[PDB]
Amino acid sequence: SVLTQSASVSGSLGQSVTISCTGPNSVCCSHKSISWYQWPPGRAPTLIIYEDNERAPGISPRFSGYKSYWSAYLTISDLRPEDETTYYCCSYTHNSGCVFGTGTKVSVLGQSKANPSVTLFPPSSEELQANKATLVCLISDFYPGAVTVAWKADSSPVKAGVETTTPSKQSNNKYAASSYLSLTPEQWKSHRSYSCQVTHEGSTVEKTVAPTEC
């Protein structure tokens, strides 16, 4: 897009941050209207600002817009955990639809570290009859929104049939992810145990399952 935003910006809880939106004269700023949308991945967006500096109905006064000759700006004051998401500006006129900017990810700093809650499930009897084996490692309530996952067969690394999702933001503004280890029923029953190791900020938690009593 010819309408450029800062790729990433950060501010601390209770403080402010400003996001910029600029480009060639065809998109900003004289005689061009600028709006701002909050657009969380996988959700519908929310209009924040229209016509450069007008808050959409019911929007908190924490959000403000300003457009100079050079650039448009969205300022988010008194930052909250829910503000940590993606924002798009749009350039528009009476007769010309939205040109969306390149997007900005806002990080809200100064939040407490939250350790992941991890649950590991063994394959079901139904699946082994089918005949497959899937270990499921579910990971929730962690902040900041990044983890790495490693699997173990007894005590040694596994590498085959591991597939892990990207992190996604929960409604409580912490993050979630999941990892899947595919096995044959024979692999499953041929070990004493399998483990999913979830690493978050250097700290690793381990959950383990075993075929013996299933």
């Binding site: 209009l47 699946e127 579910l138 597939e163 999702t165």
Partner: protein
């Protein structure tokens, strides 16, 4: 306010066309522009066009001028302040890069110089363009696992395995159970098939007194699966309590 309710997810082959609907209520349909906006992995958010229900006036982005047809039905009056309507968007000559989420959205009249600016959005329609056939999920129980022994809590769930295309929806006990539910975004396997999981955290004492049924819907394959999660656990920490 009101409501914009869009048609369901669709799988289409390359070269095909698709017509998405946007049914409206809770406001006077005739007096607000309807926009169409999409999000694709390759291009990000992209405004496609708008149409005026009253006049049929249209504005299409150049990229969609020769492949998108926007239409509306006539407004069905209800009250002075509300009516029902419908808008449609037909897109032709589909290709893989058209895969994404398509939104309809009603314009903001308070934006006096651009009353079309998209303000109230529909829930979105997921369009997948692919040569692969639809595949319904296989659902397997995620047997109860200890969360906290001292707390007397457990987690149980359902694995929704190997389906295509997105999306799947999951509810618990026909929507009666909503607290402590965690439904995870899907993983996209090398097979080209998706899998996801839904888990609920419950008192371990309830495993003997409460039935837990995940209701899984994959509308693209027209399949539903209601799996009762068998509550007898293989988890040692939980086993001791039974």
């Amino acid at each position: 306010q009101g409501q914009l309710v869009q048609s369901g997810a669709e799988l289409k082959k390359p070269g095909a066309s698709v017509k998405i609907s946007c049914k409206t209520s809770g406001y006077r349909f005739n007096f607000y522009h309807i926009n169409w906006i999409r999000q694709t992995a390759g291009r990000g958010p992209e405004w496609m066009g708008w149409i005026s229900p009253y006049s049929g006036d249209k504005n299409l982005a150049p990229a969609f001028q020769d492949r998108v047809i926007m239409t509306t039905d006539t407004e069905v009056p209800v009250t002075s302040f509300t009516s029902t309507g419908a808008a449609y968007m037909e897109i032709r000559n589909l290709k893989f890069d058209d895969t994404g989420t398509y939104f309809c959205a009603k314009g903001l009249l308070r934006d006096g110089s651009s009353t079309w600016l998209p303000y109230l959005w529909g829930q979105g329609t997921l369009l997948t363009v692919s040569s692969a056939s639809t595949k319904g999920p296989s659902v397997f129980p995620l047997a109860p696992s200890s969360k906290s022994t001292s707390g007397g809590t457990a987690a149980l769930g359902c694995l929704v395995k190997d389906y295509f295309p997105e999306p799947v929806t999951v509810s618990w006990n026909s929507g009666a159970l909503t607290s402590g539910v965690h439904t995870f975004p899907a993983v996209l396997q090398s097979s080209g098939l998706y899998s996801l999981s839904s888990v609920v955290t419950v008192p371990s004492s309830s495993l003997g007194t409460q039935t837990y049924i995940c209701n899984v819907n994959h509308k693209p394959s027209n399949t539903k699966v209601d799996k009762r999660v068998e509550p007898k656990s293989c988890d040692k920490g939980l086993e001791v309590l039974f």
